[PDB]
Amino acid sequence: GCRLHNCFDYSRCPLTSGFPVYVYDSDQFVFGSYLDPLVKQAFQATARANVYVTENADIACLYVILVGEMQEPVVLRPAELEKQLYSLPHWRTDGHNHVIINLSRKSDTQNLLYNVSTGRAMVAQSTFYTVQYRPGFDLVVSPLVHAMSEPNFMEIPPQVPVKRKYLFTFQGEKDYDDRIIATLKAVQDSKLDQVLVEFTCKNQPKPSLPTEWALCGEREDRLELLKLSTFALIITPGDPRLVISSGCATRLFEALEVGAVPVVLGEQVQLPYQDMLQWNEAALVVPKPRVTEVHFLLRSLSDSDLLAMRRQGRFLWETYFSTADSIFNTVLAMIRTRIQIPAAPIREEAAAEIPHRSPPYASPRYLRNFTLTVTDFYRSWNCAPGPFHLFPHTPFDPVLPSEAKFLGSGTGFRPIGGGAGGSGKEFQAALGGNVPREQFTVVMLTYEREEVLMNSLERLNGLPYLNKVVVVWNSPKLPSEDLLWPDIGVPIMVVRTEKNSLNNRFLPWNEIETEAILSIDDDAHLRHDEIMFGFRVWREARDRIVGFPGRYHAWDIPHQSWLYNSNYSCELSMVLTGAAFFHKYYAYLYSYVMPQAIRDMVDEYINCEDIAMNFLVSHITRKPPIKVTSRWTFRDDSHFHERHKCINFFVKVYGYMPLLYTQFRVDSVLFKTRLPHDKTKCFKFI
Template identity: 25%
Template sequence: MSCPSVGRTLRPCRRPSLCLLLLLVFLLLSLVALVVRLRTPPSEHRLSANTSQAVRRHHFYDSDHSFNLRFTSNSDSTDSSADSPSCRLSTCLDIGRCSSSSPLRIHIYPWIDSSSAETNWSPLFASIVEIISKSVYFESNPNKACLFLNTVWDTLDRDPLSADFQKPSAVMTTSQPLLGGRNHLVFNLYSGSWPEYRELDFQFSDPNYGNGIQEILAKGIRVKTSQSESLFRPLFDISFPLFPRDHPLHGPPVRPPLPPTPPAPPTRFIGRRRRRQHLLVFKGKRYVYGIGSETRNSLHFLREDEDVRILTTCRHGKRWQDLKDDKCDEDDAQYAAHDFQTLMRNATFCLVPRGRRLSSFRFLESLAVGCIPVLLSNEYVLPFADVIDWSSCVVRGDERLLLQIPETLRQFSDNHVLRMRRHCRHLYDQFFSSVDRIVFTALSSIESRLLPHSRFPDFVLNADTLSTQFLTTQWLFGNRNLNPTLYSSRRLYSNETLRIVAVVSVDSNRDSPALSRLLYRTIIPLLSSETIAEIAIVLPEKGVSLPPLVVHSSRIRLHRNVSSFAAVVPDDDDNNTDAVLYLSSQSLLTKEEIQFAVGVWRSFPERVVGFEARNHFYSSAKQRFEVSNRWTNRFSWVSSDGSIVPMAVLRASVDSSSSECQSLSLAFISSHFSRLAPLKVGQRKHVTNSSNDRSFSALSARRDCFDGLIRSYGYIPFIGSRLRLDPLLFLDSVDKRRKKYLQMESI
């Protein structure tokens, strides 16, 4: 078989007219391509030629109601100093300074009092500086610090149209950052301005800002909102949530109780499936032109469904009246007739489209009410994505497939919806309910990258159980002496013996013989209880005659002149103490009451369990909050006398010379970390046979301590409750000789 000849000549065209037509079409297409290339701006030539740059396409409605397309890249969207895509932990960070600092140590410089007139900070930036300076993350010595926060430049709000925009000052031109800008934090909520809203345009190009800020922007860790996937530096930057200026700093604001609000519309039942009244809701601005209009101006197409409620308004900016369309008047009328909070509380899903920037206030607002957010922002990096598992809470939609969203949401089962709603509320309470929690979550996320050996388990951070919430909150606030298995089901809900230490505080105001009898009566039930591993007796400086039983028992330790409850129990891992039972020398608890209280705490290990409950209330006459010393059905905290306190709460407590203040301090810490009310256990009679807590000095000391704690925490974390666990409620028809607690009926 011979091979075909390679040098064969081409055949002539048999149909010259067809060949000529094809040649003309080819020449015409080449001419069109040449004209388009000549009319294309040079910047777009550079974008199409350089394939290594990230190209971003923005569709938007222009002011003349025409639909346009704009191309931008990393270099066009920001100053060259702020664009450092090569920054990683190994290139822009001195990790050696962070090898031995746990928790993360942050130095703030130059130190300026936030109340000083020399500062021109925004209120939120001043709050962030104050939160870090008063936390365990603060380090006053720059040689021991891992990260730095420069207070000369307020980088939080960099929109020139904002009232919080910081203008240049004389000190900026002479200020230079430490370490050449490395190991610095850059907090930012708003960057860019109308009409481009460039992501990394921090508006520091004015020479009066100095060159120091350019070094910080180039090498610092950006803790920033509205970060896109193309400009986000993985494992280096932190995606920050967008929150309003009036977001609570530490918790709900301290204000008088509001009058009762009318009940929300009832939940609709569809067959046996329990659903909220609306499937999907949204209320917000509808941009008729500019960035973000390609998404928000198309939301009206979703109104055709009955269970979808979309409310928009055109009232935005200065030119909205000149550029409004035919639908604006009708939309504004419906927009003003509905309350957004009521809509969200009666909706299963809340639409969260992007605004002028990638993020939106609607994201945290929907999480706060347990409404599942449906995100419409294709390039948006979710907040703290390397720490929080958003797959069980957020539904990510595609801006290009808007009409498919309602039908997709209808495919979710009821059980899946309930789990997502519960997890959304958990994430908000745990990480986003206050400014300090948001800041501490960002710092904990950075620490987990720099110190991976001390990283808190991700399953504990994302679990929505009560015990893991308690541990996660303490971890965010800087408590590193935690054991994640402290409240594990293997230990607390098994037959393993718990180690509980009883601390008995001796009152020195009584004479020694009477005190000796009371002390003997208090210790006998503790020695006979199997759940009490050790007894610590705190004695005053004066001499006290102790019973022989106290002196010779190996389970009893004596302490003198102790300033706080925490100093009595050793704070080490070998001790392995689960909880502490506090009693006074005048306590009248029996063995059965103690064992029942321990059983209650074992079922709720994240709460404080006590016998003597108290309440706080708002006094209209004095225009202030006060604490009550009366026994009422409603209570919000329990006294330390006769209470069981988890060891994790005790480790986070502070020293106090007053017993009244120690009780309130433990109550504040427990409610602040767990966000749960304490548990009251019923008893046969009053815990103590003394009325010293009603004396004027005791009430005055309690009031002063309560006011001081409110100033320290910034809010009142107490949560009211009416639940009382009484042993009489657990009686049954079983013969008492077969029970574990033989004298339960006599309590």
């Protein structure tokens, strides 16, 4: 049988040449008129927009043809479908480097390609029999539910409380069948916990494969019961030759959508994208012989583990299942990863520099292409943000051991005291730490404050590790020609914004040449020694927000909602970006991967952009931010209530509150310490 090492032509697909894809126009072939119109429409829309797609058929590494779900009843005959396949313009003789895509939307009994010879082409679909599944070569994909429609998070029930009305539920109609039915009916009768198990359909059943449990009713009927259940049961078909069915995949989709943790009875099943995804992290898979132990097992699991499973299922669904675009990207990424080609680089925000009248070292980029696609496979596919983009830098890059900088990897390192260590002097003379030398860029948002901007920019004169200052001009009116900008020793670049928005401060501007960004308001007052210590801390904590202003979130018992609080406190949960360090990676994520609703809300209130970034970074890392110094001030009411509303809405969007509390801040080691006369403090006041 065909495998990737004896039916794929690698000569078309060099490692460095990218991943050019050619998509056939199905309207120019007999398939087009018989396709289900919504599938055709959505697929054409997503293929038109995809970055990998090319019109140049001669350079293509992969060819894509949509044969799709066809209208019922299927007019086309298998032999004539085969005849059309073998007649495609670039189906040279055997169809190597072709993937045939057949997306399921409405029918769970259609098996077009069962009697069709596909030569050397790969097949991506949701239904497979053992005689036509080739592991590692074929792809199991999710069904296309939301075609020409959007899934709204507002209708997804919240992740908490962990326990819902029913422990588990099942609805279906149709050797272990009798055993399973008796065991689950006994569980229902005993009433140790509330369950709702039905083995007949009240609403007329949907047509099904011969030995499969049929879906009951409409999609809206099922979600109503699934929204009330902690777990969702998925019983696999009794036929041993059936690897995966569209019905079981639909059940899995509907369970993951509303947060019911799937419980699969039967290990022979191949779940969608199972080659890349660790489904054990999001679903429980149990052998049918162990059905008598399912109730005990489900009762044994802890709340936090169950909640982690629910969260991982939400991630998987949103990233790979929810839209046609996601399905197409997942197919392309699976094929690209199998043949070890890196993802396409993520786009930067090109900007126009406003001309004005008045040594930087840039961090290296794109050093881990192959490592990220092949070596870090698990993190790439099972952790946010996902595998679809290649970033120039990443805060999770492995660091070298302490010895390497002395034994052959010292390029760029600046040890303290040459490796002997030392006191304040040796500390102030070198960055030290566990990573090479580095600079940072200041990003400043300004609006109708033309004079304070000059003063604040002048205050930045002489910062030791400053690469450049980026001034984001938000006002509709351009700066005047008579405005003399100060000479602070580093370039000042004024970038023109296409529209007025607080989200512009987190745009990944092309002008930013450093991993580190210092985000500062145009009227903030920071001493040089605070900035430098914060930079060192961030160098030690690259994946956190490291900043000066602190806030925390509080629970309102009478209303069972969250409140934003800014009193002085002994514990914190947010560090405002009015003065904070963070990695540019998060700017890309904020601008292009974070949900659109959050940015739209930021625009609506012209407020809460810092809260959104804290939400994002806590969601990614599951760690709180770092408070750097003792200061709390750095110098309306509706502006204050808007933030309570922002917090509540963001909780709705994410499904949970990602913020976490910290009960400590950081200071320099020898801060306020009584030293011997030979020693010197690291900082005079910090």
